[PDB]
Amino acid sequence: IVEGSDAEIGMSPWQVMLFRKSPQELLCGASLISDRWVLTAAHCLLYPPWDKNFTENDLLVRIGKHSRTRYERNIEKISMLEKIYIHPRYNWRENLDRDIALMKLKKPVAFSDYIHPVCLPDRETAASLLQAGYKGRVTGWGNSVLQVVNLPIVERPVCKDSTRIRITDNMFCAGYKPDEGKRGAACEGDSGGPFVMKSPFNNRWYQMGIVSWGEGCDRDGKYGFYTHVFRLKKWIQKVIDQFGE
Amino acid sequence: SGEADCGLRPLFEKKSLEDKTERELLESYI
Protein backbone atom coordinates (compact mmCIF):
# COMPACT_ATOMS: atom_id res chain seq x y z
CA ILE A 1 0.00 0.00 0.00
CA VAL A 2 1.15 3.55 -0.75
CA GLU A 3 -0.38 6.86 0.40
CA GLY A 4 -2.82 4.99 2.64
CA SER A 5 -3.86 5.61 6.23
CA ASP A 6 -3.50 3.56 9.42
CA ALA A 7 -6.24 0.93 9.78
CA GLU A 8 -8.29 1.35 12.94
CA ILE A 9 -8.29 -1.59 15.34
CA GLY A 10 -10.67 -4.33 14.12
CA MET A 11 -11.36 -2.42 10.88
CA SER A 12 -10.35 -5.35 8.68
CA PRO A 13 -10.82 -8.44 10.88
CA TRP A 14 -10.77 -10.83 7.89
CA GLN A 15 -7.16 -9.85 7.18
CA VAL A 16 -4.78 -12.84 7.03
CA MET A 17 -1.00 -12.87 6.72
CA LEU A 18 0.60 -15.79 4.87
CA PHE A 19 4.10 -16.79 6.08
CA ARG A 20 6.85 -19.16 5.06
CA LYS A 21 7.91 -20.98 8.25
CA SER A 22 11.63 -21.24 7.56
CA PRO A 23 13.22 -18.88 6.92
CA GLN A 24 10.39 -16.96 8.51
CA GLU A 25 9.01 -14.58 5.86
CA LEU A 26 5.76 -12.74 5.05
CA LEU A 27 4.83 -13.91 1.53
CA CYS A 28 1.44 -12.46 0.81
CA GLY A 29 -1.87 -11.12 2.01
CA ALA A 30 -4.98 -13.31 2.30
CA SER A 31 -8.51 -13.17 3.72
CA LEU A 32 -10.63 -15.20 6.12
CA ILE A 33 -13.88 -16.43 4.56
CA SER A 34 -15.03 -18.90 7.23
CA ASP A 35 -13.61 -20.46 10.41
CA ARG A 36 -11.57 -22.96 8.33
CA TRP A 37 -11.00 -21.24 4.98
CA VAL A 38 -8.56 -18.59 3.75
CA LEU A 39 -8.58 -17.07 0.25
CA THR A 40 -5.40 -15.78 -1.48
CA ALA A 41 -3.79 -15.44 -4.95
CA ALA A 42 -2.54 -18.63 -6.62
CA HIS A 43 0.71 -16.89 -7.64
CA CYS A 44 1.55 -16.54 -3.92
CA LEU A 45 1.61 -20.36 -3.65
CA LEU A 46 2.53 -21.63 -7.12
CA TYR A 47 4.91 -20.02 -9.59
CA PRO A 48 7.38 -22.59 -10.95
CA PRO A 49 9.72 -20.11 -12.75
CA TRP A 50 10.60 -18.66 -9.35
CA ASP A 51 10.71 -22.08 -7.73
CA LYS A 52 7.50 -21.35 -5.79
CA ASN A 53 5.47 -24.55 -5.13
CA PHE A 54 4.60 -24.64 -1.49
CA THR A 55 3.38 -27.66 0.42
CA GLU A 56 1.05 -27.20 3.41
CA ASN A 57 3.82 -27.74 5.94
CA ASP A 58 5.98 -24.99 4.43
CA LEU A 59 3.54 -22.33 5.54
CA LEU A 60 1.44 -20.79 8.27
CA VAL A 61 -1.00 -17.96 8.64
CA ARG A 62 -1.36 -15.26 11.26
CA ILE A 63 -4.79 -13.76 11.82
CA GLY A 64 -5.98 -10.76 13.84
CA LYS A 65 -2.69 -8.84 13.49
CA HIS A 66 -2.35 -5.07 13.00
CA SER A 67 1.42 -4.74 13.68
CA ARG A 68 3.85 -6.07 11.09
CA THR A 69 6.69 -6.97 13.47
CA ARG A 70 5.35 -6.83 17.06
CA TYR A 71 3.68 -9.85 18.76
CA GLU A 72 0.08 -9.13 19.77
CA ARG A 73 -0.57 -11.33 22.83
CA ASN A 74 -4.11 -12.75 23.29
CA ILE A 75 -5.12 -11.05 20.00
CA GLU A 76 -3.25 -12.58 17.06
CA LYS A 77 -3.78 -16.26 16.26
CA ILE A 78 -1.60 -18.72 14.35
CA SER A 79 -3.06 -21.45 12.16
CA MET A 80 -1.42 -24.30 10.34
CA LEU A 81 -2.68 -25.47 6.95
CA GLU A 82 -4.37 -28.81 6.28
CA LYS A 83 -4.48 -28.39 2.50
CA ILE A 84 -3.82 -25.96 -0.33
CA TYR A 85 -6.15 -25.75 -3.31
CA ILE A 86 -5.15 -23.93 -6.49
CA HIS A 87 -7.63 -23.18 -9.25
CA PRO A 88 -7.21 -25.95 -11.83
CA ARG A 89 -7.24 -23.47 -14.72
CA TYR A 90 -4.82 -20.96 -13.09
CA ASN A 91 -2.75 -19.50 -15.92
CA TRP A 92 0.79 -18.79 -14.69
CA ARG A 93 2.33 -19.25 -18.16
CA GLU A 94 0.59 -16.12 -19.73
CA ASN A 95 -1.35 -13.67 -17.60
CA LEU A 96 -2.22 -15.10 -14.20
CA ASP A 97 -5.82 -15.78 -15.34
CA ARG A 98 -7.82 -17.35 -12.48
CA ASP A 99 -5.26 -16.17 -9.88
CA ILE A 100 -7.04 -17.74 -6.93
CA ALA A 101 -6.33 -20.29 -4.22
CA LEU A 102 -7.91 -21.64 -1.05
CA MET A 103 -6.15 -22.77 2.07
CA LYS A 104 -7.96 -25.02 4.54
CA LEU A 105 -6.85 -24.47 8.16
CA LYS A 106 -5.94 -27.45 10.37
CA LYS A 107 -8.30 -26.24 13.12
CA PRO A 108 -11.10 -23.68 13.17
CA VAL A 109 -9.95 -20.19 14.22
CA ALA A 110 -11.96 -18.60 17.05
CA PHE A 111 -13.69 -15.37 16.10
CA SER A 112 -13.13 -12.23 18.20
CA ASP A 113 -13.28 -8.42 17.95
CA TYR A 114 -10.18 -8.75 15.75
CA ILE A 115 -10.94 -11.90 13.78
CA HIS A 116 -14.10 -12.26 11.68
CA PRO A 117 -14.80 -13.52 8.16
CA VAL A 118 -15.70 -11.42 5.11
CA CYS A 119 -18.65 -12.40 2.83
CA LEU A 120 -18.27 -13.90 -0.65
CA PRO A 121 -20.28 -11.89 -3.22
CA ASP A 122 -23.67 -13.08 -4.42
CA ARG A 123 -25.19 -12.40 -7.83
CA GLU A 124 -26.89 -9.17 -6.64
CA THR A 125 -23.74 -7.71 -5.11
CA ALA A 126 -21.57 -8.59 -8.13
CA ALA A 127 -24.08 -7.12 -10.59
CA SER A 128 -24.73 -3.97 -8.56
CA LEU A 129 -21.41 -2.99 -7.05
CA LEU A 130 -18.75 -3.95 -9.54
CA GLN A 131 -19.17 -0.79 -11.61
CA ALA A 132 -16.71 1.82 -12.83
CA GLY A 133 -16.25 4.63 -10.31
CA TYR A 134 -17.51 2.68 -7.31
CA LYS A 135 -14.86 2.34 -4.63
CA GLY A 136 -13.58 -0.66 -2.77
CA ARG A 137 -10.98 -0.98 -0.06
CA VAL A 138 -7.60 -2.69 -0.02
CA THR A 139 -5.60 -3.32 3.14
CA GLY A 140 -1.97 -4.36 3.50
CA TRP A 141 1.42 -3.16 4.59
CA GLY A 142 3.09 0.09 3.56
CA ASN A 143 5.75 0.20 0.88
CA SER A 144 4.62 -0.48 10.73
CA VAL A 145 0.87 -1.08 11.09
CA LEU A 146 -1.87 -2.22 8.70
CA GLN A 147 -2.62 0.38 5.99
CA VAL A 148 -5.90 1.08 4.19
CA VAL A 149 -6.71 2.70 0.86
CA ASN A 150 -10.09 3.16 -0.89
CA LEU A 151 -9.86 2.86 -4.67
CA PRO A 152 -12.31 3.36 -7.54
CA ILE A 153 -13.02 0.59 -10.02
CA VAL A 154 -11.78 1.47 -13.55
CA GLU A 155 -13.73 1.23 -16.84
CA ARG A 156 -12.89 -2.06 -18.58
CA PRO A 157 -11.60 -0.51 -21.83
CA VAL A 158 -9.44 1.92 -19.79
CA CYS A 159 -7.98 -1.01 -17.82
CA LYS A 160 -7.14 -2.86 -21.05
CA ASP A 161 -5.48 0.22 -22.59
CA SER A 162 -3.31 0.66 -19.48
CA THR A 163 -1.42 -2.64 -19.67
CA ARG A 164 0.09 -4.99 -22.26
CA ILE A 165 -1.42 -7.90 -20.31
CA ARG A 166 -4.52 -9.59 -21.78
CA ILE A 167 -7.33 -8.73 -19.36
CA THR A 168 -9.92 -11.49 -19.01
CA ASP A 169 -13.44 -11.51 -17.63
CA ASN A 170 -11.90 -13.09 -14.49
CA MET A 171 -10.10 -9.82 -13.75
CA PHE A 172 -10.94 -6.21 -12.97
CA CYS A 173 -8.84 -3.14 -12.29
CA ALA A 174 -8.93 -0.33 -9.79
CA GLY A 175 -7.08 2.81 -8.82
CA TYR A 176 -7.03 6.53 -9.34
CA LYS A 177 -6.26 8.17 -12.68
CA PRO A 178 -2.57 9.18 -12.72
CA ASP A 179 -3.03 12.71 -14.13
CA GLU A 180 -5.94 13.40 -11.75
CA GLY A 181 -3.53 13.38 -8.81
CA LYS A 182 -5.73 12.00 -6.05
CA ARG A 183 -3.48 9.84 -3.87
CA GLY A 184 -3.50 6.23 -2.66
CA ALA A 185 -2.62 2.94 -4.35
CA ALA A 186 -2.36 -0.84 -4.01
CA CYS A 187 0.93 -2.42 -5.01
CA GLU A 188 2.46 -5.69 -6.16
CA GLY A 189 3.42 -6.29 -2.52
CA ASP A 190 -0.26 -6.37 -1.56
CA SER A 191 -0.77 -9.50 -3.69
CA GLY A 192 -3.23 -12.02 -2.26
CA GLY A 193 -5.03 -9.50 -0.05
CA PRO A 194 -8.70 -8.64 -0.39
CA PHE A 195 -10.50 -5.86 -2.27
CA VAL A 196 -13.70 -5.40 -0.27
CA MET A 197 -16.87 -3.35 -0.66
CA LYS A 198 -19.52 -2.40 1.89
CA SER A 199 -22.94 -3.22 0.52
CA PRO A 200 -25.49 -0.39 0.80
CA PHE A 201 -28.21 -3.05 0.62
CA ASN A 202 -27.45 -4.91 3.86
CA ASN A 203 -24.47 -2.98 5.31
CA ARG A 204 -22.18 -6.04 5.07
CA TRP A 205 -18.68 -6.28 3.67
CA TYR A 206 -18.06 -8.41 0.59
CA GLN A 207 -14.78 -9.53 -0.93
CA MET A 208 -15.06 -8.64 -4.62
CA GLY A 209 -11.41 -9.01 -5.54
CA ILE A 210 -8.00 -10.43 -4.71
CA VAL A 211 -4.88 -8.32 -5.50
CA SER A 212 -3.35 -10.22 -8.42
CA TRP A 213 -0.78 -7.69 -9.64
CA GLY A 214 0.12 -4.01 -9.28
CA GLU A 215 1.60 -1.92 -12.08
CA GLY A 216 1.95 1.32 -10.09
CA CYS A 217 3.60 2.37 -6.82
CA ASP A 218 7.26 1.38 -7.35
CA ARG A 219 6.70 1.05 -11.12
CA ASP A 220 5.60 3.47 -13.84
CA GLY A 221 2.21 1.82 -14.52
CA LYS A 222 -1.28 3.04 -13.69
CA TYR A 223 -3.50 0.50 -11.97
CA GLY A 224 -3.78 -2.55 -9.74
CA PHE A 225 -5.40 -5.67 -11.15
CA TYR A 226 -7.68 -7.99 -9.25
CA THR A 227 -8.99 -11.53 -9.50
CA HIS A 228 -12.80 -11.30 -9.92
CA VAL A 229 -13.95 -13.42 -6.97
CA PHE A 230 -17.56 -13.77 -8.08
CA ARG A 231 -16.49 -15.03 -11.55
CA LEU A 232 -14.63 -17.87 -9.87
CA LYS A 233 -17.19 -18.63 -7.16
CA LYS A 234 -18.29 -21.95 -8.77
CA TRP A 235 -14.81 -23.32 -8.13
CA ILE A 236 -14.66 -21.89 -4.60
CA GLN A 237 -17.95 -23.58 -3.79
CA LYS A 238 -16.90 -26.92 -5.26
CA VAL A 239 -13.82 -26.96 -2.97
CA ILE A 240 -15.62 -25.81 0.19
CA ASP A 241 -18.54 -28.18 -0.49
CA GLN A 242 -16.35 -31.28 -0.74
CA PHE A 243 -13.67 -30.52 1.85
CA GLY A 244 -15.24 -28.18 4.41
CA GLU A 245 -16.38 -29.19 7.90
CA SER B 1 -18.84 -22.06 10.13
CA GLY B 2 -19.45 -18.29 10.30
CA GLU B 3 -21.02 -17.59 6.90
CA ALA B 4 -24.38 -16.44 8.35
CA ASP B 5 -22.70 -13.54 10.21
CA CYS B 6 -20.00 -12.75 7.61
CA GLY B 7 -18.97 -9.17 6.88
CA LEU B 8 -20.36 -7.55 10.05
CA ARG B 9 -17.51 -6.26 12.24
CA PRO B 10 -17.71 -6.63 16.03
CA LEU B 11 -16.11 -3.21 16.66
CA PHE B 12 -18.08 -1.39 13.94
CA GLU B 13 -21.46 -2.57 12.47
CA LYS B 14 -22.20 -4.65 15.59
CA LYS B 15 -21.60 -1.56 17.76
CA SER B 16 -23.38 0.91 15.41
CA LEU B 17 -20.01 2.63 14.80
CA GLU B 18 -18.51 3.61 11.47
CA ASP B 19 -14.85 3.62 10.53
CA LYS B 20 -13.06 6.79 9.44
CA THR B 21 -13.31 6.29 5.66
CA GLU B 22 -16.28 4.03 4.95
CA ARG B 23 -18.31 7.16 4.10
CA GLU B 24 -16.02 7.57 1.07
CA LEU B 25 -17.17 4.19 -0.23
CA LEU B 26 -20.83 5.06 0.30
CA GLU B 27 -20.38 8.40 -1.48
CA SER B 28 -18.83 6.64 -4.51
CA TYR B 29 -22.21 5.04 -5.17
CA ILE B 30 -23.89 8.44 -5.67
Ligand SMILES: *[C@@H]1O[C@H](CO[C@@H]2O[C@H](CO)[C@@H](O)[C@H](O)[C@H]2NC(C)=O)[C@@H](O)[C@H](O)[C@H]1NC(C)=O
Ligand atom coordinates in the same frame (compact mmCIF):
# COMPACT_ATOMS: atom_id res chain seq x y z
C1 LIG C 1 4.26 -28.70 -7.48
O1 LIG C 1 4.13 -29.64 -6.42
C2 LIG C 1 3.22 -30.69 -6.75
C3 LIG C 1 2.83 -31.49 -5.51
O2 LIG C 1 2.52 -30.55 -4.51
C4 LIG C 1 1.28 -30.82 -3.84
O3 LIG C 1 0.18 -30.60 -4.70
C5 LIG C 1 -1.06 -30.37 -4.07
C6 LIG C 1 -2.17 -30.40 -5.12
O4 LIG C 1 -1.98 -29.36 -6.06
C7 LIG C 1 -1.00 -29.05 -3.31
O5 LIG C 1 -2.23 -28.85 -2.65
C8 LIG C 1 0.08 -29.08 -2.24
O6 LIG C 1 0.46 -27.75 -1.95
C9 LIG C 1 1.33 -29.89 -2.60
N1 LIG C 1 1.86 -30.59 -1.43
C10 LIG C 1 1.44 -31.71 -0.80
C11 LIG C 1 0.23 -32.48 -1.25
O7 LIG C 1 2.06 -32.13 0.18
C12 LIG C 1 3.82 -31.53 -7.87
O8 LIG C 1 2.99 -32.63 -8.17
C13 LIG C 1 3.92 -30.64 -9.11
O9 LIG C 1 4.52 -31.32 -10.20
C14 LIG C 1 4.66 -29.33 -8.82
N2 LIG C 1 4.49 -28.38 -9.93
C15 LIG C 1 3.34 -27.82 -10.31
C16 LIG C 1 3.40 -26.89 -11.49
O10 LIG C 1 2.24 -28.01 -9.77
